[PDB]
Amino acid sequence: SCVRDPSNYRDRSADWYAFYDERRRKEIIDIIDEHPEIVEEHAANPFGYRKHPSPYLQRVHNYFRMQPTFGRYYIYSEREWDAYRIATIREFGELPELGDERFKTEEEAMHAVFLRRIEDVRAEL
Amino acid sequence: SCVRDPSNYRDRSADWYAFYDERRRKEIIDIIDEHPEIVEEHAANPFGYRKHPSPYLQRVHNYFRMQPTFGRYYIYSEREWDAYRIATIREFGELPELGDERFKTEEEAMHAVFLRRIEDVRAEL
Amino acid sequence: MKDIAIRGYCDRPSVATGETIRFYVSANETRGTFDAELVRLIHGDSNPAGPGYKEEAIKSDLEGQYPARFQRTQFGSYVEVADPDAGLQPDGAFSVHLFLWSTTPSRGRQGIASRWNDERQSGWNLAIEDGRVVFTIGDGSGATSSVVSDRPLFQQIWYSITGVYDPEKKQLRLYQKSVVNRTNSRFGLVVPLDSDCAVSADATVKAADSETSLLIAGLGEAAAQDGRTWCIAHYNGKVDAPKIYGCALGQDDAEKLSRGEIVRPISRLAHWDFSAGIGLNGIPTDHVVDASGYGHHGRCMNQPSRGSTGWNWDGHEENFIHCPEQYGALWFHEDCLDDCRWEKDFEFTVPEGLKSDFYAVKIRYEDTEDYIPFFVLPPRGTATAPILVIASTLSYLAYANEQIMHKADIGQAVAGHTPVLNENDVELHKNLSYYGLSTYDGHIDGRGVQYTSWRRPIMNLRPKHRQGFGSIWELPADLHLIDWLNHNGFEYDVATEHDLNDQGAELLRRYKVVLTGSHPEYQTWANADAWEDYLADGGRGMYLAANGMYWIVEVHPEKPWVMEVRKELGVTAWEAPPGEYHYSTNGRRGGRFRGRARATQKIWGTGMSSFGFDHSGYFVQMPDSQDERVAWIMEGIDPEERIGDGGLVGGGAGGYELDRYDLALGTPPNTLLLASSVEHSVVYTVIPDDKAFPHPGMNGGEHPFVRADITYFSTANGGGMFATSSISWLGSLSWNDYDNNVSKMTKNVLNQFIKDEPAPRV
Amino acid sequence: MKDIAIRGYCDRPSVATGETIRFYVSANETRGTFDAELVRLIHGDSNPAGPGYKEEAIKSDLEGQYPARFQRTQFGSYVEVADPDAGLQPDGAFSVHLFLWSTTPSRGRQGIASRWNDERQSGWNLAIEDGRVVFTIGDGSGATSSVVSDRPLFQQIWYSITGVYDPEKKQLRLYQKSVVNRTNSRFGLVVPLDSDCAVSADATVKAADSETSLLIAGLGEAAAQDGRTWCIAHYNGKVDAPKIYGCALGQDDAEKLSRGEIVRPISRLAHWDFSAGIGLNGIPTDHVVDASGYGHHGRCMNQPSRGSTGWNWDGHEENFIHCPEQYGALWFHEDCLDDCRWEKDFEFTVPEGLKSDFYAVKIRYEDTEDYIPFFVLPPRGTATAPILVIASTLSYLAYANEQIMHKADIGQAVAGHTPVLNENDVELHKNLSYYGLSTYDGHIDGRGVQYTSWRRPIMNLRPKHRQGFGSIWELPADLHLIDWLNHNGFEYDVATEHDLNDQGAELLRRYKVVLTGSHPEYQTWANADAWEDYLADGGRGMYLAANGMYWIVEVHPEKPWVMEVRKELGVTAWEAPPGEYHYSTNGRRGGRFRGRARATQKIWGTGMSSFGFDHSGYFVQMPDSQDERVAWIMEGIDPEERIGDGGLVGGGAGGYELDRYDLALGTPPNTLLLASSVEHSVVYTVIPDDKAFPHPGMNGGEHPFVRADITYFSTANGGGMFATSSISWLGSLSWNDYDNNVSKMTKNVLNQFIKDEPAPRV
Amino acid sequence: QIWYSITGVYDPEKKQLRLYQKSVVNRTNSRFGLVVPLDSDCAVSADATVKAADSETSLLIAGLGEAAAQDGRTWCIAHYNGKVDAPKIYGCALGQDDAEKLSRGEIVRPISRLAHWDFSAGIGLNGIPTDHVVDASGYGHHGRCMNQPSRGSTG
Ligand SMILES: [Fe+3]
Ligand SMILES: [Fe+3]
């Protein structure tokens, strides 16, 4: 037994993080398949203002909101209260990848981000 | 302005704790009215063994499990794996108030406690 | 219902060959006799799905009949000053000054400081009656003279109190002044508090000799019998710098005393400085120094909290070893207990040939059956087996007489089901004075219990006890391992965490392999050092548990049967109040092992990640299970099987509490991850140690941190460490009549570790 | 997309009449000119539902055109030793010894210690290349001689490093030894680590004069111009006790050096002891002492972490003021910044008559518009209004250039929606070197940022900025109050938390009433003392915010523009590593105000209870609202109305962060509870400070602690304190064209507090 | 004037009396220093033919009880000259390894102590102005200094 070269070792918990993530994706797709109404719910009131999200919608949100920042979507305000676009976080010293479509309101942009994330999870599976 | 007599003051947050608690009770009764299946779910598997509780059932559990110990129900084992009764927590130096009915299994006792708590919340309202 | 008739304890947890252990027994009434015999514990769990209860009767001189008698227990902490010559009972004018900080001012009559006989109503006392400070004298005829304050005490506010007897003016006087600062009291200087008073009353009697010892935080019940003064009317809160003067003090003297000046030093009869004895190693003593130089030294009783923040604590220094002048207070609770102080009923000397194992004294009285467990060590300086089992006696003391489900509002919420309690829990609730509290309970004041004792009847220590979290806990759970070993014909020795604390790495170095308990949660700094040194030099260890080495504990140097722990934010029942984090026993910052850069990962490979008690999950095999280097661990297990689906603890191997792999917390770089536990519900939670900002869904099945990791690594000179990272693991050993993956894996690891070959390199 | 062309800052936050403020401006390239003018900020929020953006142009000498130029910023912390006479460039045999603790060993080329010219490749350097320690010399001809270690460094492991140049043997030698103990490294003594080596190489060149200053944790870019050495190849991690010897050291010398012995003391050329200067008041200086007695003193640059745990830290003492010999390390990060050190572009002297308010310098360059905000104080020692507004400049520094949504994984989870970011956030992400990090961000190493500076362009300080949590934050949010005051014709003065820190209770005592900001989260001990003293003696205060007085901060005695904070378990972005909790600026235990027995309840009546940023709720009136004693507060409000349903911050008065009534944490006994906020979703969470054991459902609508409490109490001499306990409160003042319950209640309280009458008794 | 660690053991199971003696000389504590090749260590055994009866006297440090205590006074004879440091009694029979650990200042088998007198217990900023000797085993067998022995003496 001897530990000499740091290159002979790695973060083995990564093996769990893969195994976990796959299962979670399979779970999320099941929820959206068994509770299709939640999508329409999110379209009506993305903030949950005076109408709090459904537990199943909250479960989908709980999965989506805690993802790694690198490659994660956010909303870029091109013009205040006029134009919003979907941006992707990249490495430090890189500009974000902006979407082609413009959105009149931030709520519309949030719902578009939600739909795009569901489509990405479907594409991976 | 003078603060001299401790008897002229009280924990005024009690006024909130009443106002809160009433609202919560009205909420719980609504859930059990709008999701009657959860009761039957709890009868099938109170531990959630390989079948995790529904979010609405979990909400009812979340309300019931965090109540003050004084007056709260637990299960007394009269005979190991043979007889269980429903007991009420009282002041230090008092014996608990035991129920008249006996239960063969701890799961049956837990479901009986659940039903009794729902009946108590109904009685108060 | 069925009620407890007999209870008992022993002086020490462990005993070696030719050493003596003493037993103390109390009945409800003095009536008849009881039968005592010796048994060896094998299996405690009485679950029909399992092997069931198992013990072996052992012939000894201990076996026979003994008279059954009631033995009174002194309950609550105080200070006792023995005064045989009635020096602290003056014949003329006298005064008493102290600083007080009351936690339950309206909780009946509470004696602050007294030389008082309550049976005869003789001597002098300063007490709290109807939430007011009262100074009383009595001549023993039943007639008493009292002076009562007109300003009732505010809860957790520092006060300067002076009581004066003036025979020349034939008067009793009382002076009360609030001494609130920015950091010492419940509320600050913004509150326009008016609690100052100077009151006078007529003195019609003279203070007679009480024939009792002087008490701080109590009153004498009656005249001392065989030189013992029973303490009643217990006080709750802090007392700082009590003193007696042989003259009558005025208003100006009281004013100077309230600011911390020592007025008329020559006139003092006694002055107790509770801070006297604080050094770099803290204050590990019960000795209270008389600072007036008249040798009226005191003794702490039932372990009051030493190194407590005082009346003048401004919060510039938060370690009592660096600012002793601001840490002159003692905290008294009415429900403290460090020793039952009963009379011995019988003793046992360990004969030659009695094999090292778990033992108990079985007592039958009326229809009641009680057990007094203990541990037999091998002959001093020798080993009698290649396997050592470490009993978690520190963890047993931490959970001793636990009453979570009767006291804690969130007990059932944490449990994740309605708790199931037995006659032991009802007995604890009914008669608290006989048993005392756990470190998981708070005092009647609200502050968490910091000290736990072995010298008391501990009901949850008996093999037949079932715990509130839905199955067996601590010692009974450890028997799951013992039975398994006895079933597989393995030869092992037994040692306690106290024995490891005493003997260090030398105890561990006598064995090929060392096995931990079901829950080695509470450890000393020395225990961690011993484990590290043992594993580093080629020792082999099996961590068949979770949440090990979480809390730092210290054993009291003067009282080896007393254990101290001070808890902070994390997986805790309570938080230490500001400036009281350092241990009085050694003067060091304790609490979480992780907070002191010694997380469990650094020694055993995995560390605490989650807890939940609704049920248990099962393990799924990870890629490293297929590695050629660990083919020996997974031998006879099909690579597509679940590991521990079914058990006596939540019906699975992965549950109750979980540990995880983490390089950042000090997991060895060469450690392999063999399997991870799944099927954890919302009841399983992310621990506060792993949270920056709490957000929704930080719980089982919604966060990556909620899991258990089966791990192995190798060290120098053919040493190795294997971890299962689950409390419920030992619960799954006997499942399906000892035919399961958990049993197979444990047997493979233990068979490899007891060979003369070096542990396999990874 | 739209990109930033111009940026700038000022030397100091606040300025009084006849005092000077300097401005520093940088463009992307040196070309053309920019326009500068003076404006008074009124309303920052551009929400169509609200009043919209409002400013007033002010005539000044500042107005005009200035040339636009690029100004380079030195980024990353290091130590600089000025050596004009090349004393630390020996002509013969020499050696360099140090202790290293690397956090990013594989992150490119990192200079450990050097007197090196990288342009000419002249002098000597010890660096990390391809994760290996390399010792290099160069003669300036481009030819260099190097010796490379054969053992790559492990992450966060303490190493003893010796580099030797021996011209007699024509050799370069390198000695590397692991010095791991129980508590100082990532992993413990159980790991069989083999990272020791002794390597030799041929020296073909001689070390020439680099014409640069000696650097710790960096390399010299080129020959010093105007006596400035630019530092490149920044090192990440700790350096402890670096020293240079004027002789060639052997293996035995390296072995003795690795154990902490000072070998051949006479032969030392320099020896920097980073612990030299630690006292009872910590180490508030950038001066590094040369312990060899040759006066080669150093200077800390960009504020490296002082009072850091060293190579020999055994964890027996966790305060650096009591064990300085174990705290001899400095922590360097490649992304530290305490001062941009730019050239002044123009200055402004405050004329007589300019009213105390929020001001900004407005700059136009190309199509880009930038703001440099600052505050005008009244003439020194006088007040010009009965109302004082305290700008939360400490909180502004805490959130300065915050990048939560780009760095923190749980940023969106805490926010409770997809964040909305503008060109300022993109600019921060693109060019980090220009701006630096917030106290809510971690360094590239992982350790949280402890130091924040005013002397840098702060993008989230400008009035038009919108923050990631879904609305405006800090200074713009404070403008919600300012506009409201200006709308109601109230006369007020403006002061900063820095000014309060300097002036104490004397500043507050000049006004009838003092108004806090939207979020006074970060305060000094002196600020809490000043507030307590002001309110105690008849001062009147309005706490129109939540989460006030949560974190203890200290202002750097030598650099008033630098702020320190060290965070712990609670409502935190990060936790301080073991043994590094005490502040280098004053040597005191900081972190949470609550942890030091000074919870916000003790001073302002309510304390932090919950946070959540999905939206805001509304207040429901409690019984005490109907009390005759507070009829003045609720005048013109129907007793069956909701208070603040609608607003510019989450559409409600009760939201974002909440405070609650609590007697146990020091709420005055006479305090009344007028209203409580409702309609909080699962996003709102119970804070870790209020949890013993986390259990399911500790969140909004499922736990009693998730609420805001509107409270009032009265003090001595006609003083009073009113609290709304919500960040979003000021967001609801202008709702429905200034016609709402929130505006009415605030106006009633402010009208009562500015009268000559004592505040009403409760 | 040489510092010694002394252990006396009564073992009825082996029917034995044992004595362990070890010199604990350092640079500054003894008459002569570490240069002297001192050989004063020993481990000796003898047969125990009688049992220890109750003396009906108080325990003495630096003396022997003359006779049975009359009116609760024990007369002290055969007076010792020199220093005693950390005397303790154990309720078990100690071995060679226990004696070796005791000679280095380690408190072995703490639970097994019957009494342990720490003469330094009570030293503060004002010295030790008392005759009270603290029992550090937590069994309340406190002692009393008689005829003022020199306190605050080098150990
Ligand atoms: Fe525990
Ligand atoms: Fe904050």
Side-chain angles (χ1 to χ4, degrees), chain C residues 79-91 94 114-116 123-124 207-216 223-224 227-229 244 269-270 272 290 292 294-299, chain E residues 132:
Chain C
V79 176
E80 200 189 338
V81 183
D83 192 28
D85 319 316
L88 302 182
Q89 180 49 80
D91 284 315
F94 74 95
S114 67
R115 209 187 168 280
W116 182 255
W124 70 265
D209 184 8
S210 72
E211 312 198 283
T212 72
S213 69
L214 187 137
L215 293 179
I216 308 300
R228 184 172 192 179
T229 302
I244 311 164
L269 292 176
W272 299 280
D290 183 9
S292 70
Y294 296 118
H296 295 129
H297 302 299
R299 281 172 38 84
Chain E
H132 183 266

Side-chain angles (χ1 to χ4, degrees), chain C residues 399 440 473 519 521-522 547 551 571 657:
Chain C
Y399 286 96
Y440 285 77
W473 193 258
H519 199 197
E521 186 182 3
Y522 294 76
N547 197 27
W551 292 116
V571 190
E657 307 204 334

Side-chain angles (χ1 to χ4, degrees), chain A residues 2-4 6 47-50 52 58 65 68-69 72 75-77 80-81 89-93 95 110 117, chain D residues 46 48 153-154 192 194 405 407-409 412 416 418-421 429-430 466 614-616 645 650-651 681-682:
Chain A
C2 194
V3 182
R4 58 173 67 184
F47 283 111
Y49 187 66
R50 305 284 170 276
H52 298 151
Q58 186 61 50
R65 287 171 182 169
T69 54
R72 104 172 297 163
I75 298 157
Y76 178 72
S77 75
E80 230 171 27
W81 316 106
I89 294 165
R90 294 160 65 182
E91 306 303 25
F92 275 86
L95 275 76
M110 279 149 201
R117 280 169 178 176
Chain D
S46 63
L153 295 174
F154 281 78
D194 177 22
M405 299 310 161
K407 294 189 94 296
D409 293 340
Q412 193 169 335
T418 298
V420 181
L421 305 181
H429 191 74
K430 179 165 72 232
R466 301 195 74 78
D614 63 332
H615 61 262
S616 299
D645 194 3
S681 72
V682 73

Side-chain angles (χ1 to χ4, degrees), chain C residues 266-327:
Chain C
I266 195 67
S267 292
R268 292 178 296 169
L269 292 176
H271 178 200
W272 299 280
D273 181 22
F274 300 144
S275 71
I278 293 165
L280 281 308
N281 67 334
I283 179 158
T285 190
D286 293 332
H287 183 266
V288 178
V289 172
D290 183 9
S292 70
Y294 296 118
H296 295 129
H297 302 299
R299 281 172 38 84
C300 292
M301 302 301 295
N302 287 325
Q303 190 60 49
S305 309
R306 305 208 70 168
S308 284
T309 63
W311 75 271
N312 53 346
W313 186 77
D314 56 23
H316 89 269
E317 185 58 49
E318 292 177 38
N319 195 349
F320 78 93
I321 74 169
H322 301 122
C323 190
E325 71 278 8
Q326 292 190 8
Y327 279 94

Side-chain angles (χ1 to χ4, degrees), chain D residues 53-73:
Chain D
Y53 184 77
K54 278 187 261 177
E55 66 164 51
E56 186 170 25
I58 299 142
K59 277 73 72 174
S60 58
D61 302 326
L62 181 134
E63 296 179 343
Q65 271 180 353
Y66 304 94
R69 59 215 171 86
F70 177 70
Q71 302 184 301
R72 191 180 169 185
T73 310

Side-chain angles (χ1 to χ4, degrees), chain C residues 115-394:
Chain C
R115 209 187 168 280
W116 182 255
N117 190 332
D118 200 69
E119 196 161 80
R120 297 208 281 268
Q121 297 272 298
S122 63
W124 70 265
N125 86 77
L126 195 74
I128 303 174
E129 322 206 300
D130 184 56
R132 293 164 186 276
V133 177
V134 185
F135 183 57
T136 304
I137 61 172
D139 65 339
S141 288
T144 48
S145 294
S146 298
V147 56
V148 180
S149 181
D150 48 340
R151 293 292 192 281
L153 295 174
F154 281 78
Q155 175 170 350
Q156 296 184 13
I157 298 304
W158 277 107
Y159 284 96
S160 180
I161 305 292
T162 312
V164 176
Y165 170 55
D166 196 339
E168 198 284 328
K169 260 170 265 189
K170 282 293 168 271
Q171 238 178 11
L172 290 173
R173 295 202 294 283
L174 190 61
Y175 307 97
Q176 176 179 331
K177 177 173 170 63
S178 282
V179 287
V180 168
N181 75 23
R182 301 183 192 281
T183 54
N184 66 351
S185 294
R186 174 163 268 205
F187 53 71
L189 301 170
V190 303
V191 176
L193 186 63
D194 177 22
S195 304
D196 293 22
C197 79
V199 179
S200 293
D202 302 310
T204 53
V205 292
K206 209 174 70 175
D209 184 8
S210 72
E211 312 198 283
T212 72
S213 69
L214 187 137
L215 293 179
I216 308 300
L219 299 177
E221 193 178 29
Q225 300 225 74
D226 308 333
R228 184 172 192 179
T229 302
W230 289 94
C231 177
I232 67 162
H234 296 92
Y235 166 81
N236 288 306
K238 293 176 180 182
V239 178
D240 193 343
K243 59 188 71 70
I244 311 164
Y245 283 96
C247 59
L249 295 179
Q251 215 274 310
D252 69 336
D253 296 338
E255 196 298 302
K256 287 200 293 145
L257 279 169
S258 77
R259 294 191 279 102
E261 286 99 61
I262 307 301
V263 305
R264 305 184 173 175
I266 195 67
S267 292
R268 292 178 296 169
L269 292 176
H271 178 200
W272 299 280
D273 181 22
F274 300 144
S275 71
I278 293 165
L280 281 308
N281 67 334
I283 179 158
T285 190
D286 293 332
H287 183 266
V288 178
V289 172
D290 183 9
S292 70
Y294 296 118
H296 295 129
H297 302 299
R299 281 172 38 84
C300 292
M301 302 301 295
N302 287 325
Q303 190 60 49
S305 309
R306 305 208 70 168
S308 284
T309 63
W311 75 271
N312 53 346
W313 186 77
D314 56 23
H316 89 269
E317 185 58 49
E318 292 177 38
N319 195 349
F320 78 93
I321 74 169
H322 301 122
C323 190
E325 71 278 8
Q326 292 190 8
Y327 279 94
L330 288 183
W331 202 329
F332 304 96
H333 318 265
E334 74 186 9
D335 50 354
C336 286
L337 181 58
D338 74 335
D339 193 355
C340 282
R341 299 184 177 80
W342 292 352
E343 190 213 299
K344 180 190 79 197
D345 288 62
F346 51 88
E347 57 173 37
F348 175 62
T349 312
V350 176
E352 192 44 55
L354 189 70
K355 170 251 189 297
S356 177
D357 219 340
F358 288 36
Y359 292 88
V361 171
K362 184 175 180 177
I363 291 162
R364 288 183 290 132
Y365 176 75
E366 261 55 27
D367 296 344
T368 304
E369 160 194 34
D370 201 39
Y371 290 84
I372 305 170
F374 65 97
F375 305 85
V376 167
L377 298 169
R380 287 282 165 184
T382 288
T384 65
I387 303 166
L388 182 62
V389 175
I390 302 301
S392 299
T393 45
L394 297 176

Side-chain angles (χ1 to χ4, degrees), chain D residues 213-430:
Chain D
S213 69
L214 187 137
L215 293 179
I216 308 300
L219 299 177
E221 193 178 29
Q225 302 288 269
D226 308 333
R228 184 171 192 179
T229 302
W230 289 94
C231 177
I232 67 162
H234 296 92
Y235 167 81
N236 288 306
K238 293 176 180 182
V239 178
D240 193 343
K243 59 188 71 70
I244 311 164
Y245 283 96
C247 61
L249 295 179
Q251 172 87 242
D252 288 28
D253 297 72
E255 191 51 22
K256 286 181 179 65
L257 279 169
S258 77
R259 295 191 302 262
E261 303 189 25
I262 307 301
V263 305
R264 308 198 220 185
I266 195 66
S267 292
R268 292 178 296 168
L269 292 176
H271 178 200
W272 299 280
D273 178 27
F274 300 144
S275 71
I278 293 166
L280 281 308
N281 67 334
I283 179 158
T285 190
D286 293 332
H287 183 266
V288 178
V289 172
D290 183 9
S292 70
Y294 296 118
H296 295 129
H297 302 299
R299 188 177 60 190
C300 292
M301 303 301 276
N302 287 325
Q303 190 60 50
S305 310
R306 305 208 71 168
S308 284
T309 63
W311 75 271
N312 53 346
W313 186 77
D314 55 23
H316 89 269
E317 185 58 49
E318 292 177 38
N319 195 349
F320 77 93
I321 74 168
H322 296 303
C323 190
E325 71 278 13
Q326 292 190 8
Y327 279 94
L330 288 183
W331 202 329
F332 304 96
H333 317 265
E334 74 186 9
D335 50 354
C336 286
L337 181 58
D338 74 336
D339 193 355
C340 282
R341 300 183 177 80
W342 292 351
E343 191 182 338
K344 180 200 79 202
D345 289 60
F346 51 88
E347 58 172 39
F348 175 62
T349 312
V350 176
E352 297 185 328
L354 189 70
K355 173 215 152 176
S356 178
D357 219 340
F358 288 36
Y359 292 88
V361 171
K362 184 175 179 176
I363 291 162
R364 286 198 297 285
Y365 176 75
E366 306 298 334
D367 70 72
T368 304
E369 162 188 280
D370 204 61
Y371 289 84
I372 305 170
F374 65 97
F375 311 90
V376 167
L377 298 169
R380 287 282 165 184
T382 83
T384 65
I387 303 166
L388 182 62
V389 176
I390 302 301
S392 299
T393 45
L394 297 176
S395 297
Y396 301 163
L397 281 181
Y399 287 96
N401 301 315
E402 155 276 311
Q403 301 165 9
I404 285 162
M405 299 310 161
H406 276 270
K407 294 189 94 296
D409 293 340
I410 70 178
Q412 193 169 335
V414 168
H417 58 80
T418 298
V420 181
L421 305 181
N422 55 24
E423 59 265 67
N424 291 323
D425 301 285
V426 170
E427 178 60 20
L428 282 183
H429 191 74
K430 179 165 72 232

